[PDB]
Design a protein around this motif. Structure first.
Motif, PDB file in Angstrom:
ATOM      1  N   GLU A   1       0.454  -1.285   0.058  1.00 49.30           N
ATOM      2  CA  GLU A   1       0.105  -0.327   0.126  1.00 49.30           C
ATOM      3  C   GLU A   1       0.921   1.542   0.075  1.00 49.30           C
ATOM      4  O   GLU A   1       0.706   2.240  -0.648  1.00 49.30           O
ATOM      5  N   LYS A   2       1.925   0.961   0.024  1.00 44.80           N
ATOM      6  CA  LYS A   2       2.295   2.694   0.985  1.00 44.80           C
ATOM      7  C   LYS A   2       3.187   3.386  -0.972  1.00 44.80           C
ATOM      8  O   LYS A   2       3.536   4.520  -0.556  1.00 44.80           O
ATOM      9  N   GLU A   3       3.893   1.967  -1.567  1.00 44.34           N
ATOM     10  CA  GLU A   3       4.817   2.500  -3.134  1.00 44.34           C
ATOM     11  C   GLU A   3       3.777   2.691  -3.733  1.00 44.34           C
ATOM     12  O   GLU A   3       4.014   2.001  -5.195  1.00 44.34           O
ATOM     13  N   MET A   4       2.690   3.025  -3.938  1.00 41.57           N
ATOM     14  CA  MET A   4       1.058   3.083  -4.587  1.00 41.57           C
ATOM     15  C   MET A   4       1.957   3.830  -5.481  1.00 41.57           C
ATOM     16  O   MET A   4       1.624   5.023  -4.990  1.00 41.57           O
ATOM     17  N   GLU A   5       2.172   4.323  -6.913  1.00 38.23           N
ATOM     18  CA  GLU A   5       1.536   4.799  -7.773  1.00 38.23           C
ATOM     19  C   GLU A   5       0.660   5.498  -8.383  1.00 38.23           C
ATOM     20  O   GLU A   5       0.654   7.374  -8.711  1.00 38.23           O
ATOM     21  N   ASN A   6      -0.694   5.105  -8.231  1.00 38.73           N
ATOM     22  CA  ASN A   6      -1.899   5.976  -8.882  1.00 38.73           C
ATOM     23  C   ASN A   6      -2.664   5.400  -9.009  1.00 38.73           C
ATOM     24  O   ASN A   6      -3.266   3.680  -8.875  1.00 38.73           O
ATOM     25  N   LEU A   7      -3.792   6.399  -7.744  1.00 41.75           N
ATOM     26  CA  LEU A   7      -5.020   5.427  -7.412  1.00 41.75           C
ATOM     27  C   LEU A   7      -5.441   4.948  -9.080  1.00 41.75           C
ATOM     28  O   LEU A   7      -6.853   3.886  -8.986  1.00 41.75           O
ATOM     29  N   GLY A   8      -5.647   6.399  -9.362  1.00 43.55           N
ATOM     30  CA  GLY A   8      -6.577   6.517 -10.746  1.00 43.55           C
ATOM     31  C   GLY A   8      -6.351   5.278 -11.617  1.00 43.55           C
ATOM     32  O   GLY A   8      -7.211   4.720 -12.397  1.00 43.55           O
ATOM     33  N   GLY A   9      -5.489   3.666 -11.022  1.00 47.05           N
ATOM     34  CA  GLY A   9      -5.757   2.353 -12.470  1.00 47.05           C
ATOM     35  C   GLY A   9      -6.857   1.751 -10.646  1.00 47.05           C
ATOM     36  O   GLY A   9      -7.323   0.952 -12.051  1.00 47.05           O
ATOM     37  N   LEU A  10      -6.356   1.632  -9.768  1.00 49.24           N
ATOM     38  CA  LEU A  10      -6.936   0.707  -9.047  1.00 49.24           C
ATOM     39  C   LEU A  10      -8.028   1.924  -8.619  1.00 49.24           C
ATOM     40  O   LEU A  10      -9.290  -0.146  -8.447  1.00 49.24           O
ATOM     41  N   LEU A  11      -8.624   2.234  -8.440  1.00 50.16           N
ATOM     42  CA  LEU A  11     -10.006   2.520  -8.614  1.00 50.16           C
ATOM     43  C   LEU A  11     -10.682   2.209  -9.896  1.00 50.16           C
ATOM     44  O   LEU A  11     -11.924   1.797  -9.562  1.00 50.16           O
ATOM     45  N   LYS A  12      -9.890   2.250 -11.138  1.00 49.46           N
ATOM     46  CA  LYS A  12     -10.662   2.124 -11.998  1.00 49.46           C
ATOM     47  C   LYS A  12     -10.895   0.100 -12.121  1.00 49.46           C
ATOM     48  O   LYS A  12     -11.600  -0.167 -13.696  1.00 49.46           O
ATOM     49  N   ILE A  13     -10.388  -0.271 -11.245  1.00 52.53           N
ATOM     50  CA  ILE A  13     -10.703  -2.266 -11.341  1.00 52.53           C
ATOM     51  C   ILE A  13     -11.406  -2.129 -10.195  1.00 52.53           C
ATOM     52  O   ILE A  13     -11.772  -3.339 -10.608  1.00 52.53           O
ATOM     53  N   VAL A  14     -11.676  -1.546  -9.416  1.00 50.19           N
ATOM     54  CA  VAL A  14     -12.483  -1.978  -7.891  1.00 50.19           C
ATOM     55  C   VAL A  14     -13.811  -1.642  -8.199  1.00 50.19           C
ATOM     56  O   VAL A  14     -14.990  -1.984  -8.254  1.00 50.19           O
TER      57      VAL A  14
END
Lengths: 335, 6
Positions: free
Chosen positions: A4-17
């Motif tokens: 969780e600490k070294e994430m780069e783009n929420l805008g990618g993880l959000l588009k898959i959840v």
């Protein structure tokens, strides 16, 4: 799928959840957002995604992490959103909020943009539609870089502009802004207020078509605060067209829901308890737009055209060109 | 009072 600490783009993880687990993304990211590093850009993006969704419990904890962080940009984001939540929860006054924001100050284009948008929500809340209209002219999207935040702010502003158009009796423009917020957003809060606003524009045109819009907004009214607001709109719609009202709020101290219960009592004929509601509201500090409705409901009881006169003045003071037609119409019937 | 929101 990194830690969780070294994430780069929420805008990618959000588009898959939202495409995989759309019905439970609130509880899923309520645990994921709090594990992000408060010094990174991802944690700053999470407070905006949590607040646009109005996950208030989650938003207030991300702000604490941003304020207690030690990266200057995260401290700035956390304090600006902190003042935003304070204005939402009525724990700070608008006059004291404009004084606070002055002594820091802000240098990021996002929080400089959001500082003015934040005030537009408060202006809307207390019926200062002249300040809301004029403030939106100071929002320049060309100062914001393209990306996740800009698209999220565009959604917010589409709905603020829909309410500006509504207050100016520009019903077609209000529906266009509400429709564009729907077409370019997946957030339940945005879709809910879009359909709430669509319905508001049809209150006096057609009952069924207004109710059809509120029925669509029910599908996005999971937040019990949003549910109370939709109930109030359906209560107000039922009182205007004199239809069966199953949305009367009996367990609330909010000024607007108390007025709607009084509006309901007027249509029922229970003048004694409509008057009692309006009696206690006289000891409450109602804003200029609430006072417009307040004296309109008083006019329906007393038949005094001076009550309709003062309702109109209050509606013009708040710059409400839409609902002002209610006291105007009631004296056109009187002659 | 009618209910508005954004």
């Amino acid at each position: 799928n990194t830690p969780e600490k070294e994430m780069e783009n929420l805008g990618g993880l959000l588009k898959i959840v939202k495409n995989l687990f759309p019905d439970s993304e609130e509880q899923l990211l309520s645990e994921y957002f709090l594990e992000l590093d408060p010094n990174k850009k991802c944690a700053r993006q999470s407070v905006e995604y949590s607040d646009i969704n109005q996950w208030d419990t989650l938003t207030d904890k991300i702000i604490i992490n941003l304020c207690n962080s030690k990266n200057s940009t995260s401290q700035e984001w956390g304090k600006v959103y902190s003042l935003h939540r304070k204005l939402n929860k009525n724990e700070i006054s608008l006059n004291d909020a404009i004084r606070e924001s002055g002594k820091c100050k802000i240098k990021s284009a996002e929080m400089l943009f959001f500082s003015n948008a934040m005030l537009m929500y408060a202006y809307l809340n207390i019926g200062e539609f002249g300040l809301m209209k004029s403030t939106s002219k100071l929002l320049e999207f060309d100062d914001l870089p393209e990306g996740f935040i800009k698209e999220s702010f565009k959604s917010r502003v589409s709905m603020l502009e829909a309410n500006i158009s509504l207050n100016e009796n520009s019903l077609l423009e209000a529906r266009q802004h509400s429709n564009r917020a729907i077409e370019n957003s997946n957030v339940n809060r945005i879709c809910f207020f879009a359909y709430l606003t669509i319905g508001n524009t049809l209150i006096f045109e057609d009952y069924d078509e207004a109710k059809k819009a509120y029925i669509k907004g029910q599908k996005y009214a999971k937040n019990p605060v949003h549910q109370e607001m939709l109930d109030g709109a359906l209560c107000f719609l039922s009182n205007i067209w004199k239809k069966e009202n199953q949305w009367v709020n009996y367990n609330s101290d909010n000024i607007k829901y108390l007025q709607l219960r009084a509006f309901y009592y007027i249509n029922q004929g229970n003048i004694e308890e409509a008057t009692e509601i309006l009696d206690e509201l006289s000891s409450r500090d109602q804003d200029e737009n609430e006072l417009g409705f307040y004296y309109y409901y008083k006019g329906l009881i007393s038949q005094d055209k001076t009550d309709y006169a003062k309702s109109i003045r209050y509606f013009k003071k708040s710059d409400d060109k839409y609902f002002i037609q209610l006291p105007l119409l009631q004296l056109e019937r009187m002659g | 009072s009618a209910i508005r929101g954004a």
